[PDB]
Structure formats: C-alpha cells, structure tokens
Write a protein that binds this ligand. Sequence first.
Ligand SMILES: NC(=O)C1=CN([C@@H]2O[C@H](COP(=O)(O)OP(=O)(O)OC[C@H]3O[C@@H](n4cnc5c(N)ncnc54)[C@H](OP(=O)(O)O)[C@@H]3O)[C@@H](O)[C@H]2O)C=CC1
Ligand SMILES: NC(=O)C1=CN([C@@H]2O[C@H](COP(=O)(O)OP(=O)(O)OC[C@H]3O[C@@H](n4cnc5c(N)ncnc54)[C@H](OP(=O)(O)O)[C@@H]3O)[C@@H](O)[C@H]2O)C=CC1
Lengths: 397, 397
Amino acid sequence: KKISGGSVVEMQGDEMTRIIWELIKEKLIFPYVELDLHSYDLGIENRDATNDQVTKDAAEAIKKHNVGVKCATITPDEKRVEEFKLKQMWKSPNGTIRNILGGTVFREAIICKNIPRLVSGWVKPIIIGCHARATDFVVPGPGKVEITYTPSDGTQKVTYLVHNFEEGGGVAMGMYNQDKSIEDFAHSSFQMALSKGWPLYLSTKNTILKKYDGRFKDIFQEIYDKQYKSQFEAQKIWYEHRLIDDMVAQAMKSEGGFIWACKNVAQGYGSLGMMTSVLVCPDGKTVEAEAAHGTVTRHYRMYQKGQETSTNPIASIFAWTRGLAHRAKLDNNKELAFFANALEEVSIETIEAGFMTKDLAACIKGLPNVQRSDYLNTFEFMDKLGENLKIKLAQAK
Amino acid sequence: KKISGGSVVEMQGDEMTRIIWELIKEKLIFPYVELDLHSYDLGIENRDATNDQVTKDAAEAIKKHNVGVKCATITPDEKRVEEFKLKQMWKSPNGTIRNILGGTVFREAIICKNIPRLVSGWVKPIIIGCHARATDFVVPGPGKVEITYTPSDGTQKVTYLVHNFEEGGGVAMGMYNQDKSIEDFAHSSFQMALSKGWPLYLSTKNTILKKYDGRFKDIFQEIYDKQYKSQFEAQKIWYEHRLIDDMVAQAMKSEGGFIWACKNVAQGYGSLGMMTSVLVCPDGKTVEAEAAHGTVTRHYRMYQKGQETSTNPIASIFAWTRGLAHRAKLDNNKELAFFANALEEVSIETIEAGFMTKDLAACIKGLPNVQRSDYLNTFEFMDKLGENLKIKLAQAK
Ligand SMILES: NC(=O)C1=CN([C@@H]2O[C@H](COP(=O)(O)OP(=O)(O)OC[C@H]3O[C@@H](n4cnc5c(N)ncnc54)[C@H](OP(=O)(O)O)[C@@H]3O)[C@@H](O)[C@H]2O)C=CC1
Ligand SMILES: NC(=O)C1=CN([C@@H]2O[C@H](COP(=O)(O)OP(=O)(O)OC[C@H]3O[C@@H](n4cnc5c(N)ncnc54)[C@H](OP(=O)(O)O)[C@@H]3O)[C@@H](O)[C@H]2O)C=CC1
C-alpha cells in the first residue's frame, strides 16, 4: 500500500523543530510513504560525538541519493558551547552542506489566501534565489590602493586604481566570483525555474557596476540560449534580465509566480515559519530542502516544562513536499508527487479553512490581538493535517 | 501679512511636474509665504543654453542660502538628445548637486492612514538613508588577484589575496570609502535624526564583512558618543546599530518613526508619488529637498493634447514643507514652520478625508479597479489644498 519514494536522505534536526520533525514524520510521512531514509543526526548532540564527520557524510548522501531534506539545526554560538558543553564550535551545517554541494538556495514563503502579505495582490509566491567571500582592509593612512590582477603564467600585469587616499584614511574591500560559481548560480537558477515552470528574472545592477554585474547578465543570457532556450519556449517559461528597480518595480506590479535571482539570507516580509527554503545543484538533480526559519528558541523555552506552545510547522512540511515532489520527477513516480502535491494544499487548506496556528492568527488582528481561541497550538495541528489529507486522499486514492 | 522665509533657493523642474511645481507655487506657496527665491532653471531647455553652468551655480546657492528645493528634472538619455536636440548628455543633476554638496539622501514615503502599505502597522514613516564608485574587471583567465594597498610615502606595502583563479576565469571588483565619506554619511545621518527627533538605527553587515562594515559601525558609535550623545539623551532619541536582519526583523516588528541608515536608489513599497526625498550636508544646515519620484512621462504624454490627467503632487508639496520646516529651524521663524507643519496635514487630511488622486484610489481597490468617480484629477487637487489649508489657517492665524 505504502508509496515508493526510494532513497530520500534526511537530516535529524534540533530543539523544538526536531519533534515537529518527528511529529511530521510520525504523522504525515511514515503511515503513507515508504522510503529509503538514511537519516543522519545533525544534532549538535551528535556533533560532540563523531567530530563533525557525519555532516560531510550527510552531504555525500544527497550527492548520491540526489535528495536530502533538513530539519532546523542549531549553529554553535556563544550560548551553545557553554550550555551544551561543546568540544568546539562546529561549522554551520547550512554552509557545511552548501559549500560541499555548491548549489543555490531558493527561499519562498507559501501563499495562504487568507493571511496578510507585503502585497495583497500576490497570488503565487516569488521564489527569491540569491548568490549570497571578500577581503576587506582599513588602509589606515593616505596611500593609493590598487587591485592588480597578476596572471599565473607571467603574462602582463593588470593594474587598477581603486582610489588614492589623501585627507584622512580610507577603507576598501576585494570581491570576486568565478564562472564556475556563476554558472553554478546559473544552471541552478534555470533548473529551479524549470521545475517550478515559472518565469525566471535575473537582476543585477548593470549600469551601476558594468563589467562585474554585466558578466552575470552575460552568463545567463549565454546559457538561456545555448542550453535552456528550447525547454523554455516549450512550457512558455522565459528568462528576462531586468535592473534591480526595473525588477522591483514589477515585483508588486506583478502578482508572482516567477523565480527571482538576486546578486548582492532571510529578508522578505513573510513570517519565518511561512517561508520554505530549497537548495539545488546546477545538475538539476541533488535537491536539499529545508525549513527557512530558525530552530525556534521560543516555544522551546516553553517546551521543557510542559506548557502549551503554538508553532507553525508548515515550512518543515514543505521541506518534505519539495523533497518528495523533486523526488518523484527524478524517479518518475507519479504517485509520490501526487502525495506531495496534495499535501501542500492539505497544509494550505487547513489555514484556508481559517484554522491556523498562532503566528498566522497573531498576524491577522495584530500581535497582542492573538488569543488561544483564535488559533490552535502546535501538537494539535499535526492532527488536522493527516485528517484533511487522508480524506483528500480518500476520494483521490 | 505674508510670512518671512528669507532665502530659499529653488530648482525649476521639468515636464509634467514643472507645472505641478508652478501650480504648487501659484497656489500653496506664493499667496502665503514671502521668500527670497533665487529660482534657477534646471530644465534641460536651460541645459542647452548655459552649458551646465547654472547647475553648479544652483548647487552653490544652497551652499550659501542653506536651503534648496527641487522639482523633478529629466536626466538626458537616448530619447532626450534626439527629441530635444540636445548638444550633449548633461550630468544627472541629482548627482550633480549631490557630488557638490556631498550629503546624504533620506527617502521616506508619507503616511496617509487610509492608504495601503507594506505594513498596515506602520504609524509613522521609516526614513531610509543610504550611502549609495567601484572598479570592476573580468580577469579573463587563471591568475591570482591581489588588492594591494601601496602607501603614499614608501611605507611597507600591504598585500591581500582576493582569490587565485584556476579552473576557468573569474571576475572581481574594488570598492572603497573614506572617513570623510562615512562621517559625511554619519553627521548627516545624526542631524537627520535630530530634526526628525526619531531614533537612529545604523545597520551594516558586520559579521559577513568584518573590517569594512565594522568601520561604519565603528564611526557612528564613535560619533554617537563624542558628539551627539547629549543631544540624544535630551529628547530621548537613541542610536542603536543593528544587523541588517536584526534590523529588518524589527522593521515590521516596529511601527516606524526612526531614521534608518543603509550600507549597500528607490526601492520601498510606497508609490513613487508618496515618497519625499531630502538631501542634507553633515553641517546640519544645507538641506536640499525634492520629490522622490520620476518626472512623470505618463500624464505628460496625456498632457500636451489637453486630456484630463490625474497625478499626485504630494512629494512636491513636501519638498516645500521640508524645505520650509528646515528653513525655519535654521532661521528660528516659528511662523514659517507652522505654515509648513500645517501644510503637511492639509496634504494628509484631504486624502484622510478620502478625497485623493488616482494612484491612491487606484491602489485601494486594485489597479484596473480605479475609476474617475473614485478619485480626483491633477489640476483640481491643488484647489482643495489651499482651501483646506486657508481654513486650517483661518482658525489658527
Ligand atoms: N536552519 C536554519 O536555516 C536556521 C537555523 N537557525 C537556528 O535557529 C536557532 C535560533 O533561533 P532563531 O534563529 O532566533 O529562530 P527563532 O524562531 O528562535 O526566533 C526567530 C523567530 O522566528 C519566528 N518563528 C520561527 N518558527 C516559527 C513558527 N513555527 N511559527 C511562527 N513563528 C516562528 C518566531 O517569531 P514568533 O515565534 O514570535 O512568531 C521567532 O521569534 C539557532 O539554533 C540557529 O542555529 C538560525 C537561522 C535559520
Ligand atoms: N528627479 C528625480 O529624482 C528623478 C528623475 N527622473 C526623471 O523621471 C523621468 C522618467 O520618468 P520615470 O522616471 O519613468 O517616472 P514616471 O513617473 O514617468 O514613471 C514612473 C512611475 O512613477 C509613478 N508616478 C510618478 N509620479 C506619480 C504621481 N504623481 N502619482 C502617481 N504615480 C506617480 C507612475 O506610476 P502611475 O503613474 O502608473 O501610478 C509612473 O509610471 C525622466 O525625466 C527622469 O530624468 C527619474 C527618476 C527620479
């Protein structure tokens, strides 16, 4: 009976979500889809044990299995190493999976028709990709800064004048990119638009920085022809470079439903729980999905002592849906996506029905305006999901 | 009878606004306040005549008279030089006044309680300052880029590795700043908060770029102590550096009423006509105010042929109010500010009364939802202003 998803890697999370992660697993995941879960613990409690080697292993799993998902996980900081008695600050597993897989992260909030928004006229979400090191130095006194490319083989030096500092000091910075890096940001950006079937819009500041951002605009349009052009004329999708303002002008002058690639990592007006992050590798195969929000300190301080907490587990539900929908298309299981496709609405319908958790309730009438009879708490929201779903399956399957 | 404003420079504008500028002058300005207007034409039609020398003169006026105002004006571009038969593309008078006066531009939309917004819970506007050249180069092949500070006197070279490029090429850029430039951005930022009496919040990406953005955070807090500290403890105002997200988190988690200084020029969610730009020189004296929006191609194509147009002249009205309120405090004329203070509400009340121009009407029900009986057109909106004002004066003065 259970549906066949094959190999879907998974990252055991942390703190409050880790149970939300289990609650989601226990409820909306396990009773329905059979899978190959290689489930690795990214808990910092497993990061004092194996000395980080699970994480790079975890990354390698996706690189083979082609699909990870990730619950929220703590980045070790000042409080952690003292309060968890950590052997060392371990590298941020967000970047620790990214740097390994490379890849581009596409954040988007989810559209619930009844909740407030930066734009009431956004029907479909704007999926915002972004590119993201840099050297910086304080040039404490007058002098001529020069950023000089010196070739590797002995070829002519390339001299540039950043500025010649006279009155007072200055400050400066280097910044760089690679065709590898940009084509990484390129294919991953087009593949994201392929799966989402939405228009792609790149934007750089082209006139303000000519050669640097022109290369970005250069490289998509070179790839948007030689590579993706036919797949875009099919299924109507198109790539239009725009200027930042010539884009953000039509940001609200458009409704949504397009992939949007920034050259400049949260921002947005969407409540954190709303947004679902996704990570992809230009290959169009490896796809690592996660919640877009922190590991929820709040609700957790109210967790250990048993009190009633209300937290919105949608971004984590979609981490599965994205993982599963991007699982199916890879393996061509039309059953599995349908499960995933339907589970989105199931998570949307409940709030569309007006039955929603605090943050949504708390944003409707205003922040103190929230009351327990205007929402539902956390553990009880995983109930209605399988409920609504199993029925939204019942007629379907 | 007429009020004494003294010397207030003025920039004759262009296109559709230039008449809005005159309509505002004719109606809400001339019959009430006497002034010393040195009124210079920034029209591109005066930029084929004097060969740009009025502009730098215009800038020098403010530098002495301490107050300019500016109507919108065309930047010469491809269409202009052919259609106006321009002798040359003349430098953008926005930057042509800025570079001369230096100074920082503080954009803000105006708050009308009845109009939609990025945040329904913003009572008072967020005044967004921003800092804003850069060298960029494409390093077509493998090599080691280095940004090397070489001192002016022969002192030890300072070597940095941007990156060493191997597989494929790269791209890079230089970027720089000056204490002069940042303290320019500093004093001008604090003075803006002084006049507006609002909290100042600087934000840089401090942890992502340590030394470069730390210097900014360095310099305000150095100035926020040694200079403005006492004036801020008085009148309760405070300067809190925050991180970009640790700011934008409280952007909507706060209502507004604070000056907000970005290190990174429109953006925003506010309709262009809403926002009023202001330009200030760290001296806290020279203040050049203007509308924040383009010179309105639309309405103008519909202008020459006599048809009924509807365009919202609030940003230009406030250019005077800001110019006049920042005029009074300089010269201590309590009459003149009161005129200016009151004129803001007069421009706010009319729309608060629900009587508003198209864009506001057109944003209330949606863009095609606009109808002529849901708003009022342009020439007729300068009527109600002096009307409401002269009465809002009548009881007052
Ligand atoms: N995995 C990742 O991508 C990220 C991981 N983190 C981890 O986050 C933890 C730090 O907690 P923090 O970063 O402060 O995130 P927190 O959630 O603890 O605080 C951030 C805000 O997000 C909002 N939020 C988060 N989840 C929900 C939800 N389910 N429903 C409603 N609102 C929600 C809350 O606002 P309210 O509850 O008031 O609505 C909360 O105040 C650390 O462990 C850090 O490592 C940090 C950033 C992202
Ligand atoms: N002085 C300055 O700071 C600036 C000057 N410019 C000048 O602007 C001109 C170019 O026109 P553009 O830049 O396209 O600006 P336009 O106004 O011509 O188009 C921009 C949009 O602004 C909106 N807008 C402008 N004024 C109003 C208003 N009073 N009420 C409602 N909406 C308004 C319009 O949207 P709708 O009408 O659909 O509501 C318009 O489509 C050039 O001459 C350029 O030099 C350019 C940028 C700013």
